[PDB]
Design an enzyme around this catalytic site. Structure first.
Site, PDB file in Angstrom:
ATOM      1  N   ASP B 177       0.778  -1.361  -0.009  1.00 12.56           N
ATOM      2  CA  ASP B 177       0.009   0.012  -0.067  1.00 12.56           C
ATOM      3  C   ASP B 177       0.819   1.079  -0.011  1.00 12.56           C
ATOM      4  O   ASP B 177       1.497   1.374   1.023  1.00 12.56           O
ATOM      5  CB  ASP B 177      -0.850   0.037   1.150  1.00 12.56           C
ATOM      6  CG  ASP B 177      -2.006   0.753   1.035  1.00 12.56           C
ATOM      7  OD1 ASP B 177      -2.063   1.967   0.665  1.00 12.56           O
ATOM      8  OD2 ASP B 177      -3.148   0.458   1.881  1.00 12.56           O
ATOM      9  N   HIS B 269      -9.337  -1.197  -8.665  1.00 15.16           N
ATOM     10  CA  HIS B 269      -9.331  -0.327  -7.787  1.00 15.16           C
ATOM     11  C   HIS B 269      -8.272   0.733  -8.414  1.00 15.16           C
ATOM     12  O   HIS B 269      -8.503   1.882  -8.516  1.00 15.16           O
ATOM     13  CB  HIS B 269      -8.602  -0.566  -6.458  1.00 15.16           C
ATOM     14  CG  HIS B 269      -8.585   0.417  -5.456  1.00 15.16           C
ATOM     15  ND1 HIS B 269      -9.566   1.334  -4.988  1.00 15.16           N
ATOM     16  CD2 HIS B 269      -7.191   0.836  -4.865  1.00 15.16           C
ATOM     17  CE1 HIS B 269      -8.820   1.954  -4.300  1.00 15.16           C
ATOM     18  NE2 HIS B 269      -7.868   1.948  -4.224  1.00 15.16           N
TER      19      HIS B 269
HETATM   20  C1  HEM Z   1     -10.198   1.875   2.054  1.00 15.64           C
HETATM   21  C2  HEM Z   1      -9.232   0.832   2.081  1.00 15.64           C
HETATM   22  C3  HEM Z   1      -8.026   1.159   0.684  1.00 15.64           C
HETATM   23  C4  HEM Z   1      -7.169   0.048   0.570  1.00 15.64           C
HETATM   24  C5  HEM Z   1      -7.059  -1.317   1.103  1.00 15.64           C
HETATM   25  C6  HEM Z   1      -6.481   0.582  -0.854  1.00 15.64           C
HETATM   26  C7  HEM Z   1      -5.742  -0.251  -1.193  1.00 15.64           C
HETATM   27  C8  HEM Z   1      -4.846   0.153  -2.339  1.00 15.64           C
HETATM   28  C9  HEM Z   1      -3.989  -0.660  -3.055  1.00 15.64           C
HETATM   29  C10 HEM Z   1      -3.259  -2.093  -2.431  1.00 15.64           C
HETATM   30  C11 HEM Z   1      -3.287   0.032  -3.940  1.00 15.64           C
HETATM   31  C12 HEM Z   1      -2.199  -0.635  -4.911  1.00 15.64           C
HETATM   32  C13 HEM Z   1      -0.778  -0.040  -4.494  1.00 15.64           C
HETATM   33  C14 HEM Z   1      -0.564   1.340  -4.522  1.00 15.64           C
HETATM   34  O1  HEM Z   1      -0.076   1.729  -5.328  1.00 15.64           O
HETATM   35  O2  HEM Z   1      -0.576   1.889  -3.332  1.00 15.64           O
HETATM   36  C15 HEM Z   1      -4.018   1.306  -4.133  1.00 15.64           C
HETATM   37  C16 HEM Z   1      -3.777   2.373  -4.763  1.00 15.64           C
HETATM   38  C17 HEM Z   1      -4.280   3.697  -4.946  1.00 15.64           C
HETATM   39  N1  HEM Z   1      -5.379   3.906  -4.141  1.00 15.64           N
HETATM   40 FE1  HEM Z   1      -6.120   2.786  -2.589  1.00 15.64          FE
HETATM   41  N2  HEM Z   1      -6.932   1.726  -1.216  1.00 15.64           N
HETATM   42  C18 HEM Z   1      -7.983   1.938  -0.216  1.00 15.64           C
HETATM   43  C19 HEM Z   1      -8.731   3.344  -0.415  1.00 15.64           C
HETATM   44  C20 HEM Z   1      -8.462   4.233  -1.170  1.00 15.64           C
HETATM   45  C21 HEM Z   1      -9.140   5.475  -1.440  1.00 15.64           C
HETATM   46  C22 HEM Z   1     -10.688   5.846  -0.620  1.00 15.64           C
HETATM   47  C23 HEM Z   1      -8.698   6.334  -2.221  1.00 15.64           C
HETATM   48  C24 HEM Z   1      -9.456   7.517  -2.681  1.00 15.64           C
HETATM   49  C25 HEM Z   1      -8.887   8.381  -3.492  1.00 15.64           C
HETATM   50  C26 HEM Z   1      -7.784   5.418  -2.808  1.00 15.64           C
HETATM   51  C27 HEM Z   1      -6.607   6.045  -3.767  1.00 15.64           C
HETATM   52  C28 HEM Z   1      -5.754   5.283  -4.262  1.00 15.64           C
HETATM   53  C29 HEM Z   1      -4.759   5.908  -5.514  1.00 15.64           C
HETATM   54  C30 HEM Z   1      -4.916   7.152  -6.006  1.00 15.64           C
HETATM   55  C31 HEM Z   1      -4.109   4.814  -5.837  1.00 15.64           C
HETATM   56  C32 HEM Z   1      -2.757   4.863  -6.899  1.00 15.64           C
HETATM   57  C33 HEM Z   1      -3.485   4.235  -8.281  1.00 15.64           C
HETATM   58  C34 HEM Z   1      -2.445   4.404  -9.425  1.00 15.64           C
HETATM   59  O3  HEM Z   1      -2.614   5.281  -9.893  1.00 15.64           O
HETATM   60  O4  HEM Z   1      -2.004   3.311  -9.767  1.00 15.64           O
HETATM   61  N3  HEM Z   1      -7.398   4.304  -2.152  1.00 15.64           N
HETATM   62  N4  HEM Z   1      -4.948   1.414  -3.144  1.00 15.64           N
END
Ligand code: HEM
Ligand code: HEM
Lengths: 360, 360
Positions: B177, B269
């Site tokens: 993450d 996601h």
């Molecule tokens: C609620 C529990 C959440 C979990 C467990 C989660 C998990 C993850 C994971 C595993 C990744 C892929 C690895 C990384 O690039 O960090 C990711 C990417 C991302 N997450 Fe979340 N996320 C959550 C909520 C959110 C929320 C509410 C947002 C609202 C904006 C968000 C925005 C993003 C963004 C911007 C990326 C990068 C995407 C990219 O451009 O590749 N996440 N998240």
């Protein structure tokens, strides 16, 4: 980096007792469900033993819900304990140590059911809180069919690397906590901690008294610093006894001031808690807790007081009685709110399981 | 050591944002009391500024009730934020940024008042939980005359030294993450994070969206690993996109599988959350939380999702809306239960105080 470090799971003793205390702990207190007897307890202990055997060495448990959280065990340890009600459910009252019973009442007690008792303890300690959260989840996954969660008590010490191994750490009252203790690797420790008499299955195990003790920090803040030190018998910054200069000077309980009054008070904590014979000392291995604030800013914090000893009646109760009957000055700012007792079985090898000598 | 290390308190920006995230955090949400206006706010912020100036460098705060807990700062940082309601209380409505307002409703929301809103934020981060506990008590001691505690949200990452600096860490679902994130000390970070338009007092500051997101870990446990990875778009162990090999490979949003369907799902996601322009990205700096168990062993765990960006309307809302309207597969196992928004002022030097450009 340190995440790869481990503590041995197998041995004559369970880990998590003589192990230098890790940065984080969870004490999971479980009550047995109605249908959980001797056969069910064996199934449960075999599951939990294998979970610990794998997770403590950085390998996923069987049916691990999150196997990628198993590597980097960060000195994870499991310590299993059996409460009085476990022996009743298993039909093994004759094997329960005479001293394994709820503690007698003390005048300072303000005990709450939600922090007291319990049939089965899983004490999980770890230098890392993610590893710990995962180990707790796996424990509950395998225990849920047999038990209900009575309480979960989370605590912390200093993070790994913040202080040197063996250096005394402070509690949330700012006091150095742990100066006087039996030391692993000495004959006195083995005598004080490891059971030698009583029921044979318990030889090589220990007993644990676990008391949740609230710190009245708002009152503590209002106290005069000289009075804080007088209540304990030691200085705050140095940790030295009031009769000495360095932390590890022996407190002189015979010393008097120029007017003839004891230097360490008649009802100072360390005077009332002291035992002369090193072999009768309890092993204190406490954790700090800090949980949440009222709207007007009052803290909810204290000590998870964990004392290990070969014999509760000989090594814990006499000290607690002297604190209570002697009117320990520290009682003005500390309040027991939970109390539980457990028999901690000896260790196991591969092909064995924790509690096999009792339940098998 | 890990204990003696410090982070500078003074600078063009407040610490705790570009600072590589420490092992522990507490987000303290405060509401202003009735009599707390612009004058009282200036006095409060001068007090908190001086407390932070001292504690972050290992020195006791003024009138510290436990000064022996000030040494070993362990990279302690304070980050102060102002919620929408603060501006009316100061009579500075016209200084409130247009975009500083509670988030609009999203279909996945199950928000609770006890985890939402707030007039004043104190975000305290530290590699050590005892240092952090003391910093929190000092903050509450100085703030309670002017405010009430609306909520306190504690979170953790890996302990210090468990993994190498900069390596991506896992959340409580086992996922790496933080892979795709603006890097401190780069031009893209500065454009994405630090305010440059709008009211002058906020230039050099940022905005924070703090959302408490529950992880439905029991349902997550029922899912097969292929579905877990499909829902995100990345593999669990390596963290690589499903289209690639290594964690830092760019996802291939045009790749299709043997059936002609996108390898990274239309509602995965990372597809819904992705923005092409590096200057419009949000800085994600989350903490994990794990708090207590039901009797049947159900967890209360999740993510303290902390997103920092120069413009909520352009950098946060469009992403959150796309996750919601796009039906992000991750929504099956996550639920927002709290939401709060804050404007974080620029830093100060030894002569100033946090918020002086607004409140002075
Ligand atoms: C609620 C529990 C959440 C979990 C467990 C989660 C998990 C993850 C994971 C595993 C990744 C892929 C690895 C990384 O690039 O960090 C990711 C990417 C991302 N997450 Fe979340 N996320 C959550 C909520 C959110 C929320 C509410 C947002 C609202 C904006 C968000 C925005 C993003 C963004 C911007 C990326 C990068 C995407 C990219 O451009 O590749 N996440 N998240
Ligand atoms: C929140 C509650 C308590 C606090 C803050 C506290 C604090 C302390 C402190 C500061 C010391 C001196 C340094 C040291 O040797 O560790 C000490 C010593 C000691 N405490 Fe406590 N304590 C608490 C509860 C208890 C209880 C319930 C017992 C019950 C047996 C106990 C038993 C002892 C013993 C045996 C010593 C060693 C005394 C000596 O021989 O010099 N403590 N404690």
């Amino acid at each position: 980096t340190t995440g790869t470090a481990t503590e041995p799971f197998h041995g004559p003793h369970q880990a998590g007792i003589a192990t230098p205390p890790q940065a984080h702990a969870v004490f999971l207190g479980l009550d047995l469900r109605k249908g959980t007897g001797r056969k069910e307890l064996g199934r449960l202990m075999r599951l939990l033993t294998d979970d610990a055997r794998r997770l403590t060495q950085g390998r996923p448990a069987l049916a691990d819900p999150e196997p990628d959280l198993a590597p980097l065990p960060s000195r994870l340890t499991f310590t299993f304990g059996f409460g009085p009600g476990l022996f009743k459910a298993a039909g093994l009252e004759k094997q329960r140590p005479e001293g394994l019973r709820p503690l007698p009442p003390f005048k300072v007690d303000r005990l709450e059911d939600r922090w007291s008792g319990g049939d089965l303890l899983v004490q999980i300690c770890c230098d890392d809180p993610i590893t710990l959260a995962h180990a707790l989840r796996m424990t509950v996954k395998d225990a849920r069919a047999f038990t209900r969660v009575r309480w979960v008590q989370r605590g912390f010490r200093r993070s790994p690397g913040v202080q040197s191994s063996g250096a005394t750490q402070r509690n949330l009252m700012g006091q150095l906590d742990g100066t006087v203790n039996p030391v692993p690797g000495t004959a006195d420790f083995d005598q004080a901690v490891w059971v030698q008499d009583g029921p044979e299955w318990l030889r090589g195990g220990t007993t644990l008294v676990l008391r949740r003790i609230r710190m009245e920090l708002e009152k503590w803040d209002e106290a005069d610093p000289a009075g804080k030190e007088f209540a304990v018998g030691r200085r705050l910054t140095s940790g030295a006894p009031l009769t000495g200069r360095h932390e590890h000077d022996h407190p002189d309980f015979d010393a008097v001031d120029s007017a003839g009054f004891p230097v360490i008070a008649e009802n100072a904590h360390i005077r009332l808690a002291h035992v002369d014979s090193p072999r009768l000392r309890m092993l204190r291995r406490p954790y700090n807790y800090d949980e949440g604030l009222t709207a007007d800013g009052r803290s909810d914090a204290g000590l998870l007081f964990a004392a290990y000893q070969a014999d509760i009646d000989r090594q814990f109760i006499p000290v607690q009685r002297r604190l209570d009957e002697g009117g320990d000055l520290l009682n003005l700012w500390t309040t027991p709110i939970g109390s539980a007792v457990f028999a901690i079985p000896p260790g196991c090898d591969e092909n064995g399981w924790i509690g096999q000598g009792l339940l098998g």
